[PDB]
Design a binder for this molecule. Sequence first.
Ligand code: HEC
Ligand code: HEM
Ligand code: HEM
Ligand SMILES: CC(/C=C/[C@@]1(C)[C@H](C)CCC(=O)[C@@H]1C)=C\Cc1c(O)c(Cl)c(C)c(C=O)c1O
Ligand SMILES: CC(/C=C/[C@@]1(C)[C@H](C)CCC(=O)[C@@H]1C)=C\Cc1c(O)c(Cl)c(C)c(C=O)c1O
Ligand SMILES: CCCCCCCCO[C@@H]1O[C@H](CO)[C@@H](O)[C@H](O)[C@H]1O
Ligand code: FES
Lengths: 61, 49, 380, 54, 70, 241, 48, 81, 49, 49
Amino acid sequence: ALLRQAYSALFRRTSTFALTVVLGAVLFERAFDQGADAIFEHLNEGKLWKHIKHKYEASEE
Amino acid sequence: AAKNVVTQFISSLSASADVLALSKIEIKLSDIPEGKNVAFKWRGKPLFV
Amino acid sequence: MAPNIRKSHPLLKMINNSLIDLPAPSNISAWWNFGSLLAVCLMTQILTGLLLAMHYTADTSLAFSSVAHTCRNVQYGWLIRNLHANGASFFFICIFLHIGRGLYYGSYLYKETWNTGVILLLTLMATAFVGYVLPWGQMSFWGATVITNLFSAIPYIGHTLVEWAWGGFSVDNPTLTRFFALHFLLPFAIAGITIIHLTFLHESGSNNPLGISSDSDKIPFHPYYSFKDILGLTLMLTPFLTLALFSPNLLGDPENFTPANPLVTPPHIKPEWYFLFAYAILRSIPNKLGGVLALAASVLILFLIPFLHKSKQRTMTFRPLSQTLFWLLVANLLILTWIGSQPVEHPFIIIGQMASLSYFTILLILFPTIGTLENKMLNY
Amino acid sequence: IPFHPYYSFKDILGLTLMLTPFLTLALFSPNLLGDPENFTPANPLVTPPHIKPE
Amino acid sequence: EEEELVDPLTTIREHCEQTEKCVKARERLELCDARVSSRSHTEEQCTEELFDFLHARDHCVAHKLFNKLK
Amino acid sequence: GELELHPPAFPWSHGGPLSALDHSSVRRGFQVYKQVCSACHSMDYVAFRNLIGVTHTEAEAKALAEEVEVQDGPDENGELFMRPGKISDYFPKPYPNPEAARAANNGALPPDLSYIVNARHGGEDYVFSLLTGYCDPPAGVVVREGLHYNPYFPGQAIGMAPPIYNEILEYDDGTPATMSQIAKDVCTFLRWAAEPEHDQRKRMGLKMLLISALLTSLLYYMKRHKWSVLKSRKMAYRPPK
Amino acid sequence: NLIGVTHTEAEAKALAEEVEVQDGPDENGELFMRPGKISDYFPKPYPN
Amino acid sequence: GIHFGNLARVRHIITYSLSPFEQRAIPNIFSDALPNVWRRFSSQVFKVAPPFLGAYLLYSWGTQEFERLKRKNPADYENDQ
Amino acid sequence: ANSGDFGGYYCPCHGSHYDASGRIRKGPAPYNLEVPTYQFVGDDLVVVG
Amino acid sequence: ANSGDFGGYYCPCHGSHYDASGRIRKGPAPYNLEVPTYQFVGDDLVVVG
Ligand code: HEC
Ligand code: HEM
Ligand code: HEM
Ligand SMILES: CC(/C=C/[C@@]1(C)[C@H](C)CCC(=O)[C@@H]1C)=C\Cc1c(O)c(Cl)c(C)c(C=O)c1O
Ligand SMILES: CC(/C=C/[C@@]1(C)[C@H](C)CCC(=O)[C@@H]1C)=C\Cc1c(O)c(Cl)c(C)c(C=O)c1O
Ligand SMILES: CCCCCCCCO[C@@H]1O[C@H](CO)[C@@H](O)[C@H](O)[C@H]1O
Ligand code: FES
């Protein structure tokens, strides 16, 4: 039972609660960032400079 | 959310995008006679030769 | 002595005695969340404001380009500029509902809390106005010209009063620098008075929807209303950001993208949305002084509300006639705003004078009348 | 004792005293108390030799 | 390969000018032009009609012109 | 008298709340401005560095700026002097001051295009319709000499003769330079120019919706959670007898 | 500034008209010389 | 200062309440919540809506009527030559 | 210039109508446009001020 | 330039003494003056930067 496992280990002690929020926020960030950027770039295929880029970037001369 | 909004506002103080990163400066060693020091405006702060 | 260090400490006893152990009616509706939002705006405006002030340059030959630079060069400057400009709008939206609530629920019976409120409104208006002049665009200029020109309607000391205002004999640099000074300053005076507003309040306590004493049922501000306000915050914040991020200029006039021209008044010169309704009234009275007086009164009339209360009950919750009149009044302002955004031509001109005449009657004559009437229908 | 009128009057007086040399100074000898290097527009290349703070 | 540079805009203006609304508008315009042109002392002008046409034409045009552009 | 034709609404690739600008179309837009409009229209708030990473490579940008002569100085004898452009320079003003700009356009003042799409109702939809909308004046309308008829311009008499015509230039990327193809591109540029953030501003707007969604929810629960105590509450009046 | 301190208004004005002052731009955005006005600042003997 | 203890005089009222952890946050969403959302909507929509719907018309009218006055009336140039 | 219902002038701010003489004919404006102090000292060269 | 007790440099702010090499010899200064990246691409013409 995670709810109990979590409560007992993370949420009970107001000090471990904080460590969870920090440790969590860190993970949440790194992932939420990729995901969104990934969703955004996909929604705009071939329009961003990230895409066009290869045509002039060390390709000529 | 918080960390991110601070991230932004705090770098609103950093150097802007208009702040350059310029080149060099040529100087004739014939204007600076022996036994002397001279100051040239360069990359913001003085430059001695 | 005092056991906890929350009730004794000369300071925490304040954070605690005015927002944590504060007695709040258990039944205040969402219409009471505007107080905090107004408060939050103030802090957000002030913050984003400073950030901008650190890149602005109060000088005609440099104002417009400084703001432009602030956006295109300053890291996240563009975002800060947006937030500051759109906060100005959400600030007004919030203040208008804050007022309506007061009106509809007879909170104005709290005279001092109310009068300081009106003072707040006027101050916020003056502030938002001069802010709008700093970027020195076309509206910026012509706005500065018309509003300072208003004193010209005051006989004698008039034409002089305009001279200070400008610092010269026609809008120019001095006007722009004493405006930046003024803008920089007022917000604080706002924050200051806000403290008093809230202090007078505290003498009596909050009002509540049914308008009957809630002493039989109070609750600690925290966690009841602190949580409710956090939520009320994340709600206003969503469209504020949806707006500022997805459609930046939706709410703002575009004339301000054209550097001020002392020789050309744009043909489609309107004020920022939140002033239209007054602009509408000003354009009603076809006489210099009358229009000015009508304009002044269009806001100053708020000071009279407390005195035009005849109902034997406090709110309109149980007054169906006042309600209709109340909502008829709202639609009434909603119209003036539309009118303010249209040219001075028929059918507008006529519709205009009407809505104005309508505005002042619903407030000075109707309300107090229907109020008395209602008392008789209850057999009082 | 009640601050007023004891100390209010004592402070009005304590004011007119500080005020006299403050004005005698600012009106008769303006720059007495101040460094003169600040009469020379900043030069990013030259640090004045006699650089002292206020 | 063998081609020819045609402006997709002109093509689509042709097809749209065949639209129900454009024809019925293009018609009213041709009529005005005729009377204002013939009359040698009339203050009348065919701006209004011109607009109705253009409004209709151009509206239609915008609905597809961009599919053919790059 | 006060009659006007309003532009329609084209479906720009960057119209969506989540749609970025087509950086390919902007690179072209730039070319159009650089080789056609920059002849009379200034763009004071954009600079060669701004193109970097958006539409051009650092090499390109730098060379693009070295193609211009820039006044600098003073030198050692307090003499102004020409020099090649640096990526830090702003796009070149085609006239020293408005007075002269009018002087070579029949007293007409070609506005700086930096913030144009936001200084005119209709934005790119307007600018476009105006570029492609030139035509003959209707019956009864006489256009003053030196002026041109455009129904889209307020007054219908505009001081700018149609700037673009088929093949007037050649996109070095191989795109058929028809007239609307150009207009369409240059307008896409005038947007990027009036607000470079555009793309990032929308990527943020995305992140904002998700977090906003997630968060409003979490807090709505927490608010209900606490309040339950009062929501379920039951009271009874049991006076003594 | 010389007026009422060391010179008469006449004097000051003529004193300033003894100088050539660059103004502009004109109609063709061209700079152009002109006689000085009492509102001009003392002439700089070097451009920079 | 302190207002908890002075407020008012109350007698003979019992109130029972349950911790938040013993009950549901948003209970009876269907049987209770929505029914009242509707209950409320109904009672109020006729005091509010009317005047808005009213101003709406006045808006649509004055708008369309300002447009009509832009168009020309043939009867002005049907005599011209 | 050239607008308003009096073939003169129109103030877009609050709707004042002036005629080709600069006189106030309709709207909230109080007086007629000010007429400066000028003179005709040429064939086709006038001097205001 | 040309002052201090090491015939080099002297910072009038807090009394630092640098030699003709720009090295810190006396005073509160922590390191020697920075030496830029240059090149003598001439007979009497040098290029810094
Ligand atoms: C010969 C100089 C010249 C060229 C080349 C030119 N324009 Fe213009 N443009 C003008 C003039 C003159 C005006 C002013 C018209 C007026 O106000 O009478 C103008 C005005 C404009 C306006 C709208 C002004 C308004 O008041 O609405 C836009 C938009 C514009 N030009 C865009 C362009 C674009 C895009 C191009 C390049 C594809 C271009 N111009 C090239 C001369 C030019
Ligand atoms: C800087 C502007 C303002 C801020 C930040 C502000 C803040 C507050 C706050 C936080 C509250 C308490 C919570 C609430 O009931 O909303 C409050 C209450 C109140 N405010 Fe304001 N206020 C402002 C403007 C005004 C204005 C313009 C008026 C008057 C037209 C006004 C009238 C009132 C009244 C009457 C109360 C008591 C409300 C009640 O009956 O419960 N306030 N205000
Ligand atoms: C009462 C809260 C405030 C309100 C209502 C407010 C409102 C405004 C408004 C309406 C503008 C014009 C925005 C635009 O459309 O460009 C503005 C701009 C500005 N404000 Fe404020 N402001 C507030 C507080 C502050 C404060 C205290 C500062 C700085 C400490 C500040 C500094 C500025 C500056 C520099 C600008 C001009 C540049 C720009 O527009 O970005 N503001 N303000
Ligand atoms: C300004 C504010 C609350 C602000 C914050 C900042 C708290 C101090 C902490 C958590 C938050 O984020 C709130 C928004 C409340 C204003 C405020 C008051 O002053 C008073 Cl007397 C009352 C009766 C209410 C009732 O709702 C109120 O909202
Ligand atoms: C809405 C208003 C004035 C409002 C004030 C003057 C209140 C009457 C008192 C408190 C204030 O400070 C407001 C700014 C004037 C109308 C008004 C404007 O606002 C603006 Cl921006 C402009 C450009 C015009 C042009 O004609 C105008 O008529
Ligand atoms: C309450 C709503 C909070 C929304 C927080 C979203 C944080 C914005 O996130 C921003 O995204 C940009 C592009 O992905 C990055 O370049 C910025 O560095 C980053 O701060
Ligand atoms: S800065 Fe040189 S001695 Fe301190």
